[PDB]
Amino acid sequence: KVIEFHVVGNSLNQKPNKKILMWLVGLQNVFSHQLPRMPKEYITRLVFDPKHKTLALIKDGRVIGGICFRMFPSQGFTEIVFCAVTSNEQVKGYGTHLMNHLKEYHIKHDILNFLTYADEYAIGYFKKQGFSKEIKIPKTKYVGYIKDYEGATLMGCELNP
Ligand SMILES: CC(C)(COP(=O)(O)OP(=O)(O)OC[C@H]1O[C@@H](n2cnc3c(N)ncnc32)[C@H](O)[C@@H]1OP(=O)(O)O)[C@@H](O)C(=O)NCCC(=O)NCCS
Numbered sequence: 001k002v003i004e005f006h007v008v009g010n011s012l013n014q015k016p017n018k019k020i021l022m023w024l025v026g027l028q029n030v031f032s033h034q035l036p037r038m039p040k041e042y043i044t045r046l047v048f049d050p051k052h053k054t055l056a057l058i059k060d061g062r063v064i065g066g067i068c069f070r071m072f073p074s075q076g077f078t079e080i081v082f083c084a085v086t087s088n089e090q091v092k093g094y095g096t097h098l099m100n101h102l103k104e105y106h107i108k109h110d111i112l113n114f115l116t117y118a119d120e121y122a123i124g125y126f127k128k129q130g131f132s133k134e135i136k137i138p139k140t141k142y143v144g145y146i147k148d149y150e151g152a153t154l155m156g157c158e159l160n161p
Pocket residue numbers: 034035082083084085086087089090091092093094095096097119121122123124125126128
């Protein structure tokens with residue numbers, strides 16, 4: 001019925017809010033069920049990590065999808081950690097809106113590069129979102145504090161104006 005996008009996080013500043021707190025758990029839940037190769041404890045570890053933020057897709061007050069990301073302003077890129085939409089809401093374009101919305105959010109902050117390690121079943125999604133295996137960014141800029149998930153295919157995406 002009603003759709004909303006909210007960028008949330010556990011920032012050590014001021015976010016112990018109950019509304020966003022329940023959303024973070026809802027995000028952990030959806031990520032955990034949709035991303036089996038990511039242990040649930042690990043997902044909880046990063047989703048609540050102050051350096052990470054998550055773009056949440058809320059529908060009728062409940063989280064049905066989101067994208068956890070870790071921005072690296074200095075190195076001019078953002079790491080896309082988790083992406084998922086609940087099973088019952090998939091194949092409706094929401095995954096598309098999320099990536100699109102997240103792109104604009106980054107063009108706004110002057111970050112025009114997306115780097116992620118796509119999983120076997122993810123490759124198709126990122127491809128349809130404009131990501132490509134051919135990295136348009138030097139390794140010296142990302143290879144360092146960007147987790148390289150075993151069995152994953154490193155992919156990138158450069159944003160528009
Ligand atoms: C990948 C995911 C987040 C997005 O799914 P979604 O909300 O259903 O995506 P969309 O409906 O916006 O996809 C639309 C387009 O993506 C394509 N696509 C490719 N891979 C896809 C996949 N795994 N699921 C759904 N669509 C997919 C569709 O064919 C479609 O092409 P079209 O617009 O020309 O018809 C969701 O399928 C999911 O939760 N997957 C399980 C976890 C996962 O594999 N995550 C990868 C990290 S994002």
